[PDB]
């Protein structure tokens, strides 16, 4: 991760995270299950459903992704017909 | 004894294919599977050979 760029001197971000991850405005990160497109005939139906289902990331991975990504991707986005607009916020979090 | 992986498509017209392991020294595979597109018990025949 380039903490200070050479041209503008800003902090860059790794494009792999934006390519294979999604950040909700609540701070959670969304990712796909590993191996959901490899050897489907060799796996059980329940295993295939688990692979196809989305999953979340824990605190350590979330902090790592936040460090590796700039503040642009942490903004609030109001997309037209965004499926994840419902999951953008968090409710009834008693902590 | 070597097995063969065969891709079989539905005969209901709808595009729906699934892979199955078969014995090489057997005839063309033709079974009854379940199609969720039409949600019916449909006849599936061997279409392609994918993996040896």
């Amino acid at each position: 991760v380039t903490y200070f760029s050479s041209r503008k001197g800003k902090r860059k971000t790794v494009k792999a995270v934006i390519y294979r991850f999604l950040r909700l405005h609540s701070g959670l990160w969304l990712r796909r299950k590993a191996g959901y497109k490899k050897k489907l005939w060799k796996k059980t139906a329940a295993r295939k459903r688990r692979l196809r289902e989305f999953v979340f990331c824990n605190k350590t991975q979330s902090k790592l992704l936040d460090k590796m990504t700039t503040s642009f991707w942490k903004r609030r986005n109001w997309y037209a017909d965004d499926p994840y607009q419902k999951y953008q916020d968090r409710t009834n979090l008693k902590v | 004894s070597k097995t063969i992986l065969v891709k079989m498509m539905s005969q209901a017209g709808t595009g729906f294919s699934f892979n199955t392991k078969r014995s090489r020294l057997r005839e063309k595979l033709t079974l009854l599977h379940y199609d969720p597109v039409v949600k019916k018990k449909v006849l599936f025949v061997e279409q392609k050979k994918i993996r040896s």
Partner: protein, 354 residues
């Protein structure tokens, strides 16, 4: 570490040595019979019944009823043996049995069952349905005398009321007929009690028809304390139990506190407790007849609620407990995207400041 068993072990009686000389059972049916026979014994270890409510195990039931009829056992056995020998002497019955073509006089079987062993079956059915648990709370009786209750749905349609049958308020709208064998020297009291349907007090039950001082079998000639009232079960909570109790009494019982008015449309006045009633009239009354049936809601209940009771119809519903969910975590790990939907207040997008 080893500990001493707290009692005899199950398989410590049979000898391990010389199994070949010990007889075995080769039938799964025999093994099942033996296992079920042993499973009912009070074992010293933790069993299924103790944890799943064997109803406090043994219970010394107080008996409040007529004494059993005194029958000569030897003469009864001799007569039964003679009848069996006479039946077996016939060749036509044996031919029918061989040819698998035989019929049974079901009406006579029913009559004989009611005469000799019907009371015990009725008592155990009432115990299963919990009649004694809510009428006396500590006492179960034997319905010695029969009690035939019948509702008239028209001119040629008669609905019987057996022990646990289902009778709708449409058929139960009118006062039923009660039949029982009795000489012209005894007094009887009939009480129709609805165990389920009281809106306020769970521990109280309603009275629909209480008629006391019945000379013999003439139920009509007896004075009615409470006029007959059609059943009025709730639309939601269905299958209430209505029980006819018949008591035999010796003296001419007169009571002024339990007397009901002719209209008797007040639910406050139609509040009853069989325990207190039998406490009051324990000296003379002794229960001898019982006939309980189930009744659910129908269209006829609305008319009873509106015209008769002058009330609005209560509607209930069998609501289930909400599903259990663990405490929501700040960062759920390996959870599906739908994890946030499990704690959503409503399926409406909420915009805070925008």
């Amino acid at each position: 570490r080893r500990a001493a068993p707290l009692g005899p072990m199950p398989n410590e009686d049979i000898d391990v040595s010389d199994l070949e000389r010990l007889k075995k059972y080769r039938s799964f049916d025999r093994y099942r019979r033996r296992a079920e026979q042993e499973a009912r014994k009070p074992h010293w270890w933790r069993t299924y019944r103790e944890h799943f409510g064997e109803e406090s195990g043994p219970k010394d039931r107080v008996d409040i009823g007529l004494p059993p009829p005194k029958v000569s056992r030897t003469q009864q056995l001799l007569e039964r043996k003679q009848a069996l020998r006479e039946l077996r002497a016939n060749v036509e019955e044996e031919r029918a049995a061989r040819l698998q073509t035989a019929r049974i006089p079901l009406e006579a079987v029913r009559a004989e069952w009611e005469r000799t062993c019907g009371p015990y079956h009725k008592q155990r059915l009432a115990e299963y349905c919990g009649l004694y648990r809510d009428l006396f709370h500590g006492a179960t009786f034997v319905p010695r005398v029969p009690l035939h209750v019948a509702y008239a749905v028209g001119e040629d349609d008669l609905m019987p009321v057996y022990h646990g049958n289902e009778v709708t308020p449409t058929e139960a709208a009118q006062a039923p007929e009660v039949t029982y064998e009795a000489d012209e020297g005894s007094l009887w009291t009939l009480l129709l009690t609805n165990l389920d349907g009281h809106l306020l007090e769970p521990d109280a039950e309603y009275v629909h028809w209480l008629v006391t001082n019945i000379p013999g079998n003439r139920v009509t000639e007896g004075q009615e304390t409470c006029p007959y009232l059609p059943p009025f079960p709730a639309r939601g909570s269905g299958f209430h139990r209505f029980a006819f109790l018949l008591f035999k009494q010796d003296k001419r019982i007169d009571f002024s506190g339990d007397t009901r008015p002719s209209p008797c449309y007040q639910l406050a006045q139609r509040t009853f407790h069989t325990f207190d009633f039998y406490k009051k009239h324990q000296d003379a009354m002794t229960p001898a007849g019982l006939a309980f049936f189930q009744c659910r809601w129908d269209d006829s209940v609305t008319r009873v609620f509106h015209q008769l009771l002058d009330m609005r119809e209560p509607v209930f519903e069998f609501v289930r407990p909400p599903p259990y969910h663990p405490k929501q975590k700040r960062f759920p790990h390996r959870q599906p995207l739908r994890y946030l939907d499990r704690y959503r207040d409503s399926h409406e997008p909420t915009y805070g400041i925008y």
